[PDB]
Design a protein around this ligand. Structure first.
Ligand code: IHP
Lengths: 100, 27, 96, 137, 141
RNA sequence: AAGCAGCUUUACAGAUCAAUGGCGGAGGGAGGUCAACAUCAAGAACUGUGGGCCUUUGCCUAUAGAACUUAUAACGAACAUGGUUCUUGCCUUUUACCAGAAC
């Protein structure tokens, strides 16, 4: 996700010396640096989000891309555990502080 | 770089078309 | 033409030296808006007058590195070509 | 002495390529060739506190193949039988001419976002900034 | 043997004579030879800048090739609540990959991609250094 | 890469001084800020020749010759003007003009 125009930036800043190659045969995955269920995290509109709000941003933009969540202008509907079980057992879940 | 900001030309405009980034803009 | 031809007459009379001859030929070609009124009659020649002024800005900065200011740059080959190319299009029109 | 000093570099380079050596010293030998391409910008800083003429140049032409006489006998004890015109400026035209420049930046602006941009563009010195907040008020 | 004749149509020179002309012509022909210098600063990138109405820094500007952009469909596709802002697409990217980084590119030519990174070593100072010699810039093996 | 023989010529002395065989020659050679003519942008692209189909155009197959100009495409490592038709700029009208496109 950070690689858009990585080659062009290298090839200009070193004056035609220097060259880049990018590949994915080793199939490394790594955790996105935020928390995927976090309402209080600030996502600005036109600027890239800070590093702690970063997992919450990618989830929300793909839910609006695929269709899944709908709202007035910018939806706030997370992937939440309560929609699957019940509100009743989730009441006990919210009671112990297990699921925020 | 141009970056999607500025007039398409300074021909119908009566200006020179000079653009500068604002220093009062925090980010 | 009479302007350029008479610059060569002064050298061939011995009034100016070779370095002055080159500086004068290079001065005429960058100042045809100042010296002739050619733009009054076919105004699109302001493209050629502004291209010789652009070439003079880039030539004077190569030539005057670690030198001062004042005349003495006679590298007239780029501005000569600009006027030779202008003639190319002016021959058919004036012929008609 | 760049001709002789390259030949020392020429001889020293023979060792790293075609000869086996110890391990920990090996990265010291190739570090000496790493500075050749970075051009010695981390080894030339010091106290040149004489001008190139203020030091009378006594470049002593010694070698390490000659005798040097070892005169340790001096470090022991032995027995000697031997015009600016200071004009005070009361006019303060300078502070008046700077006050007009700031007042005109403010009065030529549509918005206060565009008025702050022009003040930030001037790049006012640190000691004048208290004097700028005073004009704005 | 040097020219064909007095009509002065063809020439044919020798290697010590071509060197001497090449040494004399240093102040007018001094230029950067390797093709990677002109990355995003050659003809087709100027053509792509003209055709996309984008401005490479240092490059020329033109009138818009397709001046009518006032037509606009109000569609949910490019809505910013869907978009992840992570890298600003600066305008050099639009010229370097013109079909990827532009929606609707017209009158665009495919650019040359890359040249091998040039390793040519030459010196200007001492003529008495040999033709085959180890450069102080080389890695020592 | 030497010498010896074969091969080819060579300055040649020749057998023949016939009929022959080969390579050259039927307008010497190099040149000219001389001229006339032909030709130079297209199925990646060329004519001619022989056979067949059809009855020469076409088509298929066999074969010779292809000079110059073209792939980050072209006679020119260069680089100007005009016309028409759109769309613009400046604007009291015409000229002279602004600057993009197509032909
Ligand atoms: O207007 P300036 O900033 O003083 O620049 C001048 C100007 O050049 P341009 O006006 O064309 O940029 C002079 O040209 P003219 O005023 O005669 O038109 C030119 O002198 P010449 O063209 O007569 O040589 C002179 O150059 P120089 O002083 O080196 O002769 C040059 O100054 P810069 O060299 O500083 O641009």
């Amino acid at each position: 996700i950070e690689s858009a125009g990585f080659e062009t930036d290298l090839r200009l800043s070193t004056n035609g010396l220097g060259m880049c190659q990018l590949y994915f045969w080793h199939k490394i995955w790594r955790k996105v640096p935020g928390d995927v269920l976090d309402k209080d995290a600030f996502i600005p509109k036109l600027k890239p989000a800070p590093i702690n709000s970063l997992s919450r941003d990618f989830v929300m933009k793909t839910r609006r891309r695929k269709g899944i969540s709908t709202g007035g202008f910018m939806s706030n509907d997370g992937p939440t555990l309560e929609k699957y079980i019940s509100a009743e057992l989730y009441a006990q879940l919210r009671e112990n502080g297990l699921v925020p | 770089s141009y970056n999607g900001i500025g007039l398409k030309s300074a021909k119908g405009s009566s200006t020179s078309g000079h653009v500068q980034r604002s220093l009062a803009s925090n980010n | 033409m009479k302007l350029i031809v008479d610059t060569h007459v002064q050298f061939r009379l011995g009034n100016v030296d070779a370095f002055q001859l080159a500086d004068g030929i290079h001065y005429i070609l960058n100042h045809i808006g100042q010296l002739t009124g050619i733009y009054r009659y076919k105004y699109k020649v302001m493209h050629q007058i502004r291209a010789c002024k652009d070439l003079k800005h880039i030539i004077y900065y190569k030539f005057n590195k670690n030198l001062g200011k004042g005349p003495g740059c006679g590298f007239w080959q780029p501005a000569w070509r600009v006027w030779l190319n202008f003639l190319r299009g002016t021959i058919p029109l004036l012929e008609r | 002495s760049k001709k002789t000093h390259d030949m020392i570099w020429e001889k020293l380079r023979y060792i790293l390529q075609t000869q086996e050596l110890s391990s920990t010293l090996r990265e010291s030998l190739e570090t000496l060739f790493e500075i050749r391409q970075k051009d010695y910008k981390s080894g030339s800083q010091g106290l040149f506190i004489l001008d190139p003429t203020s030091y009378t140049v006594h470049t002593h032409s010694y070698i390490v193949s000659d005798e040097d006489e070892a005169n340790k006998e001096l470090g022991n004890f032995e027995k000697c039988e031997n015009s600016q015109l200071q004009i005070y400026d009361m006019t303060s035209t300078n502070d008046v001419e700077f006050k007009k420049k700031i007042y005109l930046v403010l009065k030529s602006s549509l918005s206060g976002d565009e008025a702050a941009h022009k003040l930030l563009k001037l790049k006012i010195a640190n000691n004048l900034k208290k004097s700028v907040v005073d004009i704005i008020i | 043997k040097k020219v064909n004749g007095t009509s002065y149509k063809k020439w044919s020179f020798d290697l010590p004579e071509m060197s001497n002309l090449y040494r004399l012509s240093t102040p007018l022909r001094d230029e950067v030879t390797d093709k990677n210098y002109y990355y995003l600063f050659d003809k087709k990138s100027f053509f792509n800048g003209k055709a996309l109405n984008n401005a490479i820094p240092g490059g020329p500007k033109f009138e818009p090739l397709y001046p009518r952009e006032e037509e606009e469909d109000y569609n949910e596709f490019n809505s910013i609540d869907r978009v992840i802002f992570r890298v600003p697409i600066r305008s050099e990217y639009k010229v370097a990959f013109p079909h990827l980084y532009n929606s609707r590119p017209r009158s665009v030519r495919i650019p040359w991609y890359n040249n091998p990174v040039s390793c040519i070593i030459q010196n200007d100072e001492e003529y008495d250094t040999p033709a085959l010699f180890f450069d102080p810039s080389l890695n020592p093996i």
